């Protein structure tokens, strides 16, 4: 007789590995200036 039918195609490959975690975010914007300092002492008499 004639040759038999071709075998089934192979299974697909495994999924690839999960990606690496992203880079750290950039640091925040600067904080505000501090409060105003206290009033100076009165002058000497």
């Amino acid at each position: 007789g004639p040759p038999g039918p071709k075998g089934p195609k192979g299974d697909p490959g495994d999924p690839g590995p999960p990606g690496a975690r992203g880079q750290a975010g950039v640091l925040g914007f600067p904080g505000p200036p501090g409060p105003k300092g206290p009033k100076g002492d009165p002058g000497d008499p």
Binding site: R21, P35, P42
Partner: protein, 46 residues
């Protein structure tokens, strides 16, 4: 005659590629306020 038996199964495929790198993290919170200013100068003498 009748056809012969079926062929064997093919080779398994190779793995897929890695996923993309994750996105960058969120921007950080704002910094703390700076220190208070210095005490003012003493007044001039009278």
């Amino acid at each position: 005659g009748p056809p012969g038996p079926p062929g064997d199964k093919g080779d398994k495929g190779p793995p897929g590629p890695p996923g993309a790198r994750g996105e960058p993290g969120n921007i950080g919170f704002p910094g703390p306020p700076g220190p208070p200013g210095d005490k003012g100068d003493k007044g001039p003498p009278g």
